[PDB]
Amino acid sequence: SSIVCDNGSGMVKAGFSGDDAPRHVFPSIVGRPKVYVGDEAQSKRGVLSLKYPIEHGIVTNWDDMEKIWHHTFYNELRVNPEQHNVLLTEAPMNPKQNREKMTQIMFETFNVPSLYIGIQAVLSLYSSGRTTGIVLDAGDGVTHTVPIYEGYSLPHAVRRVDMAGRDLTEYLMKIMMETGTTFTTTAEKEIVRNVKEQLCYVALDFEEEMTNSAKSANEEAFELPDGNVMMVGNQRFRCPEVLFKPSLIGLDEAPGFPEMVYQSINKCDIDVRRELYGNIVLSGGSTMFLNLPERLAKEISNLAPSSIKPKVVAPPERKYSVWIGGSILSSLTTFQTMWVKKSEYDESGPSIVHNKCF
Amino acid sequence: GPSWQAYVDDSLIGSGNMHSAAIIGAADGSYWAYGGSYVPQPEEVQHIQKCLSDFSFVQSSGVNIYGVKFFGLQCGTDGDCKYIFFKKGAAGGCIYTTKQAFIVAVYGNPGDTSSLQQDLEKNTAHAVTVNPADCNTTVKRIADYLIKLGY
Ligand SMILES: Nc1ncnc2c1ncn2[C@@H]1O[C@H](COP(=O)(O)OP(=O)(O)OP(=O)(O)O)[C@@H](O)[C@H]1O
Ligand SMILES: [Ca+2]
């Protein structure tokens, strides 16, 4: 009966506590007649202007966000909010005001019985079966490295990089344009996204991959809806390489996944350092490229001290880890007393989540 | 009169959100009142005072209480309140400053794993454990009350 809603920059994952997978996954957009939300706004980009209520993991416009929540409770889950506890997710370092606004919207507009807001990376860590470790969460609009001890993040050591899957799809369009074919229309961009999600992979050895792709003319065949075949070359492994070398898109101030994990760990108390290295948990859609966990493991092992053997945790269900951990956290007996009741909201106000949700 | 020890006995420890508490002079490090076993020693008090003057000391070394090392989780300022949150296994606590003093509170058992981690391993019906948020809130409400009084 408990609701778990993970609101991302690109996709919303909604379901019930206890389930092993989110029952409803739909784009986090709002379409306005030049009002519609979700898959239907996606399918109707001819009479509609599209807006993203969440940018880089942070809610930007709250009217469309309330529309997303309305479509989630009534049009997707097909449920009444007053009859169900809702566990919501937030990005690390979420501004205090934003938490207050989502709390007030949940407790007043939806008159929810109880509510809890948890950090997404922390939920992923719960999904991995531990409460201490470092989570690398890479989705569509933002990437975070979050060290966590006993279920509590270390905010001073968190790193945020505003680059993820959308930037990767744009870079794939750019580096596929060099074959003479442009990808500017809606359907062409859909093809590029499909190629990124289906054909792209992380090179275990980038230079060896370049050599083997140049000397053997290795090209994969992507079948188009009309039956024509598109040949994709080295771009397949040049697009996700951006995650390891952000300077490929001029993002020199972004260190890349291995150095991101390294610097986040090195900002922590060394007494926990080893435990952080032994539990590097990957989550999010942009961590699903083939060979990404193994490559990250090799690089972080090359960076770590000699007496430390890092371990990367990356289950095949990374993309929904945040949701799964949520559905796990709302299922634990300890968490039953951690819900913020409506009485506490009527007493202390929307600021109560600053004390109860940390 | 409302003694300092009564605050430790009834308002802090007596709330059930902590088993040890201490009100300590901010500058002189004197023991205004203390209760329980997890009360910082004088050398541990000086470390906490240095931690309140430089939060990077908490991030790199945490705080020591009763000979036990606690990891620092989060620091900052809640208005007139400087706060430090720490944790060690199933235990932890908070430090909240007032005008001329600070309060140190400790809950739980540091030699034990957290109840959430145990539930993650095997979710079993058990007794209610201390919510770390409730410990923070109780000390924050107290500390805010002394600041209103001027202490
Ligand atoms: N198998 C895959 N391989 C590579 N990328 C993928 C794969 N599946 C999804 N993606 C990409 O991952 C992104 C979606 O991931 P996710 O659902 O974790 O993001 P989000 O929660 O919407 O965003 P954020 O965490 O940035 O706020 C999209 O850019 C999508 O194209
Ligand atoms: Ca996300």
XYZ file of C-alpha atoms and ligand atoms in Angstrom:
541
model
C 0.000 0.000 0.000
C 3.005 2.272 0.505
C 4.003 4.321 -2.549
C 7.562 4.679 -3.853
C 8.030 7.481 -6.398
C 11.523 8.212 -7.744
C 11.440 11.477 -9.718
C 14.364 11.836 -12.113
C 15.372 14.512 -14.589
C 14.134 12.362 -17.475
C 12.108 9.430 -16.143
C 9.670 8.946 -13.258
C 9.567 5.491 -11.637
C 6.447 4.854 -9.545
C 5.310 1.740 -7.738
C 4.352 0.109 -4.464
C 6.550 -0.895 -1.544
C 7.493 -4.572 -1.458
C 7.602 -4.995 -5.233
C 10.893 -5.834 -6.937
C 10.548 -3.393 -9.858
C 8.807 -0.059 -10.527
C 5.372 -0.721 -11.993
C 5.173 2.549 -13.973
C 8.105 4.222 -15.750
C 7.284 7.286 -17.827
C 9.044 10.445 -19.063
C 9.165 13.395 -16.670
C 7.813 16.029 -19.047
C 4.748 18.250 -19.339
C 3.244 19.164 -22.709
C 1.298 22.380 -23.124
C -0.954 23.268 -26.086
C 1.051 25.658 -28.257
C -2.068 20.132 -20.477
C -0.537 16.685 -21.000
C 2.015 14.685 -19.018
C 4.173 11.639 -19.662
C 4.149 9.250 -22.607
C 1.346 11.168 -24.297
C 3.260 14.460 -24.250
C 6.157 12.500 -25.767
C 3.945 11.200 -28.569
C 2.388 14.610 -29.251
C 5.243 17.005 -30.077
C 3.247 18.766 -32.796
C 0.687 20.794 -30.856
C 2.669 20.809 -27.597
C 5.605 22.629 -26.066
C 7.524 20.263 -23.783
C 8.880 21.234 -20.364
C 11.070 19.338 -17.897
C 10.011 20.052 -14.282
C 13.288 18.576 -12.961
C 16.650 19.847 -14.227
C 19.890 18.197 -13.052
C 17.905 16.375 -10.372
C 16.411 19.580 -8.917
C 12.799 20.697 -9.321
C 12.771 23.938 -11.331
C 9.052 24.631 -11.898
C 6.570 23.406 -9.301
C 3.313 23.714 -11.269
C 4.385 21.117 -13.830
C 5.893 19.052 -11.005
C 2.498 19.018 -9.287
C 1.065 17.951 -12.646
C 3.573 15.075 -12.778
C 2.572 14.005 -9.268
C -1.134 14.223 -10.158
C -0.585 12.085 -13.263
C 1.455 9.658 -11.147
C -1.150 9.179 -8.417
C -4.329 9.170 -10.525
C -3.460 8.504 -14.181
C -0.643 5.978 -13.680
C -0.913 4.323 -10.265
C -4.696 4.968 -10.289
C -4.778 5.423 -6.510
C -5.875 7.987 -3.899
C -3.015 9.679 -2.009
C -4.802 10.023 1.352
C -4.860 6.211 1.690
C -1.143 5.510 1.179
C 2.214 6.525 2.599
C 4.474 7.973 -0.108
C 8.259 7.645 -0.054
C 9.740 10.355 -2.278
C 13.314 10.680 -3.507
C 15.543 13.737 -3.831
C 18.966 14.587 -5.170
C 21.865 15.105 -2.749
C 22.343 18.675 -1.505
C 18.699 19.420 -2.320
C 17.938 23.040 -1.324
C 16.034 23.338 1.949
C 13.281 25.397 0.311
C 12.646 22.715 -2.324
C 12.196 20.018 0.325
C 9.774 22.297 2.174
C 7.765 22.857 -1.017
C 7.474 19.173 -1.911
C 6.498 18.387 1.690
C 3.803 21.079 1.676
C 2.472 19.928 -1.704
C 2.294 16.306 -0.541
C 0.657 17.133 2.800
C -1.788 19.850 1.653
C -2.596 19.348 -2.038
C -2.582 15.540 -1.721
C -3.339 15.315 2.054
C -1.084 12.245 2.217
C -1.121 10.360 5.571
C 2.672 10.239 5.958
C 5.685 11.156 3.851
C 9.435 10.558 3.737
C 12.088 12.055 1.452
C 15.265 10.031 0.978
C 18.429 10.692 -0.992
C 18.525 8.674 -4.213
C 22.102 7.403 -3.808
C 21.295 6.269 -0.266
C 18.336 4.287 -1.619
C 20.617 2.670 -4.215
C 23.000 1.674 -1.426
C 20.065 0.104 0.418
C 19.223 -1.796 -2.769
C 22.768 -3.198 -2.720
C 22.225 -4.690 0.757
C 24.639 -2.456 2.696
C 24.428 0.842 4.567
C 28.040 2.017 4.073
C 29.739 2.670 0.752
C 30.110 5.153 -2.072
C 27.427 5.393 -4.761
C 28.056 6.628 -8.298
C 24.622 7.619 -9.625
C 24.598 8.581 -13.318
C 21.247 9.176 -15.003
C 19.988 11.561 -17.684
C 20.758 15.066 -16.425
C 23.125 14.729 -13.459
C 25.828 12.481 -12.004
C 26.712 12.215 -8.310
C 29.381 10.548 -6.203
C 27.964 10.139 -2.694
C 29.890 8.616 0.236
C 27.556 7.160 2.860
C 28.177 5.801 6.366
C 25.484 3.732 8.121
C 22.767 5.008 5.797
C 23.780 8.675 6.103
C 25.542 10.559 3.330
C 28.660 12.678 3.869
C 27.668 15.934 2.122
C 31.143 17.495 2.300
C 32.488 14.643 0.131
C 29.646 14.557 -2.427
C 30.531 15.558 -5.989
C 27.971 16.677 -8.582
C 28.626 16.841 -12.335
C 25.841 18.227 -14.548
C 26.485 15.734 -17.339
C 24.785 12.412 -18.037
C 22.671 10.586 -20.606
C 21.200 13.555 -22.473
C 24.663 15.013 -23.066
C 25.809 11.574 -24.234
C 22.976 11.363 -26.771
C 23.802 14.857 -28.044
C 27.481 13.914 -28.369
C 26.464 10.759 -30.240
C 24.458 12.884 -32.682
C 27.500 15.127 -33.136
C 29.988 12.304 -33.759
C 27.566 10.453 -36.026
C 27.153 13.580 -38.157
C 30.702 12.979 -39.449
C 29.426 10.183 -41.731
C 27.508 12.700 -43.864
C 24.096 12.040 -42.281
C 22.525 14.589 -39.931
C 20.148 13.828 -37.045
C 18.008 16.917 -36.416
C 14.379 15.739 -36.533
C 12.413 14.117 -33.720
C 12.569 10.633 -35.249
C 16.282 10.945 -36.050
C 17.042 11.879 -32.437
C 14.948 8.881 -31.374
C 17.159 6.705 -33.594
C 20.280 8.185 -31.994
C 18.942 7.489 -28.500
C 18.133 3.904 -29.505
C 21.644 3.455 -30.913
C 23.135 4.763 -27.662
C 20.989 2.452 -25.533
C 21.449 -0.634 -27.737
C 24.767 -0.458 -29.622
C 27.059 1.715 -27.499
C 29.542 0.099 -25.120
C 32.514 1.082 -22.972
C 35.874 0.054 -24.416
C 37.961 -1.993 -21.991
C 41.035 -0.560 -23.748
C 40.156 2.611 -25.647
C 43.314 2.758 -27.774
C 43.209 -0.978 -28.490
C 39.549 -0.563 -29.460
C 40.451 2.313 -31.794
C 43.157 0.167 -33.400
C 40.955 -2.921 -33.788
C 38.109 -0.833 -35.222
C 40.399 0.944 -37.693
C 42.330 -2.121 -38.892
C 39.310 -4.449 -39.216
C 36.612 -1.928 -40.273
C 34.385 -3.241 -37.483
C 30.930 -1.692 -37.880
C 27.622 -2.739 -36.346
C 24.303 -2.747 -38.200
C 21.335 -0.918 -36.673
C 18.024 -1.781 -38.333
C 15.719 1.196 -38.903
C 11.902 1.014 -38.737
C 11.703 1.224 -42.544
C 14.043 -1.760 -42.980
C 17.119 0.207 -44.031
C 20.390 -0.565 -42.242
C 22.622 2.076 -40.640
C 26.286 1.212 -40.100
C 27.733 2.561 -36.836
C 31.497 2.512 -36.360
C 33.794 3.547 -33.515
C 31.152 5.991 -32.227
C 29.661 3.026 -30.341
C 32.549 3.258 -27.874
C 33.404 6.935 -28.381
C 30.098 8.131 -26.904
C 30.307 6.538 -23.401
C 34.055 7.275 -23.234
C 32.908 10.816 -22.388
C 31.967 9.437 -18.961
C 35.646 8.578 -18.414
C 37.102 11.559 -20.337
C 34.650 14.478 -20.043
C 37.178 16.717 -21.833
C 35.779 15.153 -25.024
C 32.923 17.665 -24.691
C 35.054 20.430 -23.201
C 34.048 19.450 -19.652
C 37.572 19.733 -18.284
C 36.324 20.541 -14.776
C 34.546 17.155 -14.687
C 37.044 14.467 -13.616
C 35.345 11.361 -14.995
C 33.979 8.359 -13.122
C 37.224 6.875 -11.671
C 38.662 10.205 -10.524
C 35.193 11.222 -9.303
C 35.073 8.192 -7.003
C 38.721 8.756 -6.031
C 38.263 12.404 -5.032
C 35.003 11.761 -3.175
C 36.694 8.978 -1.189
C 39.752 11.135 -0.494
C 37.527 13.846 0.975
C 36.419 11.376 3.698
C 37.736 10.218 7.062
C 40.425 7.668 6.228
C 39.038 5.304 8.887
C 36.159 4.616 6.476
C 38.299 4.821 3.309
C 38.808 1.067 2.910
C 35.103 0.344 3.400
C 34.274 2.904 0.711
C 36.640 1.190 -1.734
C 35.117 -2.228 -1.041
C 31.543 -1.080 -1.791
C 31.466 1.103 -4.920
C 27.830 0.846 -6.031
C 26.758 1.949 -9.512
C 23.212 3.098 -10.220
C 21.333 4.913 -12.953
C 20.711 4.428 -16.647
C 24.028 5.890 -17.805
C 25.880 3.171 -15.851
C 24.388 0.406 -18.021
C 26.897 0.531 -20.883
C 28.636 -2.793 -21.429
C 32.083 -3.071 -19.771
C 31.523 0.141 -17.768
C 31.704 -1.575 -14.330
C 34.796 -3.596 -15.256
C 36.573 -0.566 -16.734
C 35.697 1.534 -13.683
C 36.985 -1.256 -11.434
C 40.294 -1.427 -13.303
C 40.827 2.344 -13.179
C 39.882 2.715 -9.506
C 42.181 -0.208 -8.678
C 44.972 1.569 -10.555
C 44.336 4.690 -8.454
C 43.834 3.064 -5.034
C 46.648 2.491 -2.517
C 48.538 -0.777 -2.794
C 46.945 -2.412 0.265
C 43.394 -1.745 -1.006
C 41.468 -3.865 -3.523
C 38.377 -1.908 -4.636
C 35.136 -3.687 -5.482
C 32.522 -2.305 -7.883
C 28.932 -3.432 -7.276
C 26.823 -3.292 -10.446
C 23.784 -5.576 -10.689
C 21.872 -5.872 -13.985
C 19.083 -3.804 -12.337
C 21.164 -0.635 -11.864
C 18.751 1.640 -13.742
C 16.030 1.220 -11.091
C 18.293 0.769 -8.043
C 17.052 4.014 -6.453
C 13.491 2.729 -6.720
C 14.260 -0.802 -5.515
C 16.111 0.358 -2.407
C 13.174 2.663 -1.772
C 10.727 -0.234 -1.952
C 13.131 -2.079 0.351
C 13.497 0.796 2.829
C 9.733 1.298 3.143
C 9.516 -2.446 3.903
C 11.888 -2.541 6.890
C 10.486 -2.578 10.417
C 12.862 0.156 11.606
C 11.562 2.542 8.930
C 7.946 2.257 10.119
C 8.627 4.774 12.909
C 10.604 7.036 10.543
C 7.567 8.232 8.567
C 6.760 11.921 9.009
C 3.131 11.884 10.128
C 0.643 14.585 9.172
C 0.355 15.544 12.851
C 4.063 16.409 12.913
C 3.497 18.551 9.810
C 0.576 20.371 11.440
C 2.726 20.936 14.536
C 6.181 21.939 13.276
C 5.317 22.890 9.692
C 7.143 22.029 6.462
C 10.518 22.488 8.198
C 10.118 19.209 10.102
C 11.657 17.274 7.200
C 14.890 19.161 7.885
C 15.142 17.338 11.221
C 13.476 13.997 10.433
C 14.865 13.520 6.891
C 18.652 13.880 6.936
C 14.708 25.711 40.454
C 15.358 24.106 37.066
C 18.901 22.862 37.629
C 21.313 22.084 34.810
C 21.376 18.445 35.945
C 17.581 18.265 35.642
C 17.875 19.284 31.984
C 20.305 16.403 31.462
C 18.207 14.017 33.565
C 14.654 14.903 32.497
C 14.806 17.059 29.356
C 17.659 15.283 27.555
C 18.247 11.718 28.761
C 14.707 11.496 30.167
C 13.281 12.002 26.671
C 14.402 8.492 25.696
C 16.215 9.728 22.572
C 19.661 9.444 24.207
C 21.381 7.512 26.989
C 24.102 10.106 27.683
C 24.114 13.900 27.658
C 26.315 16.732 28.879
C 26.061 20.527 28.994
C 29.571 21.964 28.781
C 30.959 25.492 29.043
C 31.920 26.646 25.561
C 35.136 28.460 26.515
C 36.294 26.954 29.823
C 35.159 23.413 29.001
C 33.605 23.089 32.452
C 31.001 20.399 33.141
C 27.767 22.295 33.744
C 25.932 18.948 33.949
C 26.411 15.432 32.628
C 24.722 12.049 32.740
C 25.297 8.568 31.408
C 28.493 6.797 30.457
C 29.144 8.416 27.054
C 30.233 11.806 28.376
C 33.346 13.382 26.803
C 36.510 13.515 28.888
C 38.401 16.834 29.233
C 40.773 16.019 26.360
C 37.742 14.920 24.342
C 36.089 18.225 25.270
C 39.045 20.203 23.899
C 38.821 18.206 20.669
C 35.110 19.030 20.376
C 35.893 22.711 20.982
C 38.505 22.636 18.215
C 35.942 20.850 16.032
C 33.379 23.609 16.609
C 35.989 26.170 15.510
C 36.921 24.195 12.366
C 34.450 21.761 10.809
C 37.204 20.201 8.673
C 38.453 18.561 11.881
C 35.138 16.689 12.138
C 35.326 15.541 8.514
C 38.865 14.187 8.873
C 38.760 12.744 12.400
C 35.211 12.802 13.802
C 34.714 13.100 17.559
C 35.788 10.876 20.451
C 33.467 10.219 23.408
C 34.067 7.716 26.231
C 37.104 6.462 24.309
C 34.977 5.603 21.248
C 35.604 7.231 17.864
C 32.488 8.501 16.082
C 32.460 9.391 12.387
C 31.361 12.899 11.476
C 28.311 12.967 9.211
C 27.279 16.599 8.763
C 28.060 20.009 10.266
C 26.725 23.508 9.796
C 24.872 26.367 11.443
C 21.136 26.371 12.201
C 20.980 30.092 12.948
C 22.537 30.743 16.358
C 23.202 26.984 16.623
C 26.375 25.303 15.435
C 25.642 21.596 15.055
C 27.699 18.439 14.541
C 26.135 15.058 13.727
C 28.159 11.899 14.334
C 27.634 8.148 14.133
C 29.353 4.858 14.962
C 27.576 1.626 14.090
C 24.174 1.620 15.772
C 25.210 4.571 17.968
C 25.761 8.267 17.373
C 24.572 11.638 18.557
C 24.853 15.370 18.078
C 26.570 18.482 19.417
C 24.566 21.718 19.557
C 26.044 25.036 20.662
C 24.271 27.722 22.669
C 25.365 31.254 23.558
C 27.917 30.258 26.219
C 27.778 26.441 26.156
C 27.209 23.377 23.998
C 25.297 20.126 24.504
C 26.655 16.668 23.625
C 24.168 13.797 23.295
C 24.804 10.104 22.585
C 22.330 7.328 21.720
C 22.635 3.649 20.898
C 25.346 1.001 21.127
C 28.521 1.633 19.074
C 29.616 -2.005 19.170
C 26.383 -3.019 17.437
C 25.332 -2.755 13.816
C 22.459 -0.424 12.989
C 18.907 -1.742 13.145
C 18.344 -0.756 9.508
C 21.370 -2.813 8.445
C 20.121 -5.762 10.503
C 16.691 -5.402 8.892
C 18.401 -5.307 5.491
C 20.095 -8.612 6.320
C 17.021 -10.188 7.953
C 13.887 -8.057 8.346
C 12.557 -9.255 11.708
C 9.912 -7.801 14.006
C 11.776 -6.209 16.923
C 11.550 -3.398 19.457
C 11.609 0.265 18.475
C 15.103 1.763 18.320
C 16.132 5.380 18.815
C 15.660 7.499 15.705
C 18.806 9.648 15.274
C 16.549 12.443 14.012
C 14.636 12.413 17.309
C 17.888 12.810 19.251
C 18.883 15.776 17.077
C 15.438 17.374 17.369
C 15.288 17.039 21.163
C 18.718 18.625 21.629
C 17.907 21.325 19.064
C 14.675 22.294 20.841
C 16.541 22.424 24.161
C 19.478 24.415 22.757
C 17.073 26.863 21.105
C 15.437 27.341 24.508
C 18.685 28.253 26.287
C 19.611 30.673 23.494
C 16.229 32.342 23.996
C 17.086 32.577 27.703
C 20.594 33.811 26.839
C 22.682 30.793 27.889
N 20.922 0.523 -21.397
C 21.260 1.817 -21.385
N 22.508 2.160 -21.774
C 22.854 3.449 -21.763
N 22.122 4.509 -21.411
C 20.893 4.142 -21.032
C 20.390 2.853 -20.988
N 19.077 2.852 -20.542
C 18.821 4.121 -20.331
N 19.871 4.957 -20.607
C 19.902 6.410 -20.470
O 19.879 6.730 -19.090
C 19.099 7.928 -18.874
C 17.968 7.633 -17.919
O 18.531 7.173 -16.672
P 17.782 7.395 -15.300
O 16.347 6.886 -15.434
O 18.556 6.809 -14.186
O 17.705 8.979 -15.178
P 16.808 10.038 -14.400
O 16.406 9.524 -13.073
O 15.675 10.454 -15.340
O 17.793 11.271 -14.266
P 18.752 11.953 -13.183
O 19.256 10.930 -12.223
O 19.855 12.620 -14.013
O 17.888 13.035 -12.527
C 18.674 8.413 -20.259
O 19.592 9.378 -20.759
C 18.703 7.128 -21.089
O 18.934 7.401 -22.467
Ca 17.688 9.700 -10.988
